[PDB]
Paper text:
Although their fine morphological appearance differs between classes, all vertebrate egg coats consist of filaments made up of a variable number of glycoprotein components that polymerise using a common ZP module. Thus, by recapitulating the oligomeric status of full-length cZP1, cZP1-N1 harbours its cross-linking function.
Accordingly, whereas mutation of cZP1-N1 N65 or hZP1-N1 N76 drastically reduces protein secretion, a cZP1 N121Q mutant is secreted as well as the wild-type and—because of its higher homogeneity—was used for crystallisation trials in parallel with hZP1-N1. All the cZP1 cross-links have small interface areas that range from 330/412 Å2 (A-A′/B-B′ dimers of glycosylated cZP1-N1) to 575 Å2 (deglycosylated cZP1-N1 dimer). Distinct sets of interactions mediated by these residues underlie the different homodimer interfaces: for example, in the deglycosylated cZP1-N1 homodimer, C′ strand F61(A) interacts aromatically with W72(B) and I68(A) packs against I68(B); on the other hand, in both glycosylated cZP1-N1 homodimers, the latter interaction is missing because I68 interacts hydrophobically with F61 of the opposite subunit. Additional contacts between residues in the ab loop/β-strand B region and amino acids in the cd loop stabilises the asymmetric structure of the deglycosylated cZP1-N1 cross-link; in particular, invariant Q38(B) stacks against highly conserved F57(A) and also makes water-mediated hydrogen bonds with the side chains of T59(A) and invariant D55(A).
Numbering used by the authors:
A (entry chain A): 22 to 127
B (entry chain B): 25 to 134
């Protein structure tokens, strides 16, 4: 059960984007993690500065404004901890990945 | 007889409640005037509601969110828990004052 999902994040001017490229028709659901281990489903919420998009290349994009919900300022940097759930169209999680997005890098 | 407790974290706080068979809990944020504010995830107020893997209910609040007050050098957020039956009736009502430490700036070393 190899966990081979390709993903990365890019730091922008007003927010950051997490891009994942699932294969074989799979999809990816994003969950924000807080300091207590609680998992927050990501849904379009403009006042939170959270948006979900699918790129023209088939990649799935979670965009978060630096001043959006659960983005913290730590050591003069915006930090958001996110769980990526690689999923079959049946809804089962095949693999789960955790990434700490820190912007600006490093 | 509702079991609940809260935790003070570094950036926010969480209130955990464990209602019994078939009951649920509704959360409302209280201000100094007694207004009861419904909690919604999609909100500028930096507060959220989730259901744990054990069926427990979790209220999360950032320290800089709506109606969090500074009192005696500490963050204070008052929340009402309404224990509710499947009929929609309120079985019990509890009020909790979540008090969490706040840092005194460098001025303390005047
Ligand atoms: C908030 O999101 C959680 C999932 O992360 C969901 O279980 C809960 O019902 C939501 N509460 C709302 C929308 O008030
Ligand atoms: C969410 O918002 C984006 C940006 O406006 C939009 O492209 C998308 O269709 C919306 N709905 C989703 C992701 O379900």
């Amino acid at each position: 059960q190899p966990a081979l999902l390709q993903y990365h994040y890019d730091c922008g001017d007003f927010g950051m984007q997490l891009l994942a490229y699932p294969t074989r028709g799979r999809t990816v659901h994003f969950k924000v993690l807080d300091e207590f281990g609680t998992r927050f489903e990501v849904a379009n919420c403009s006042i939170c500065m959270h948006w979900l998009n699918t790129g023209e290349d088939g990649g799935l994009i979670f965009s978060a404004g630096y001043e959006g919900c659960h983005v913290l300022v730590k050591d003069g940097r915006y930090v958001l901890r996110v769980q990526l759930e690689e999923m079959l169209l049946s809804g089962v999680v095949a693999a789960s990945y955790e990434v700490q997005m820190t912007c600006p890098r490093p």
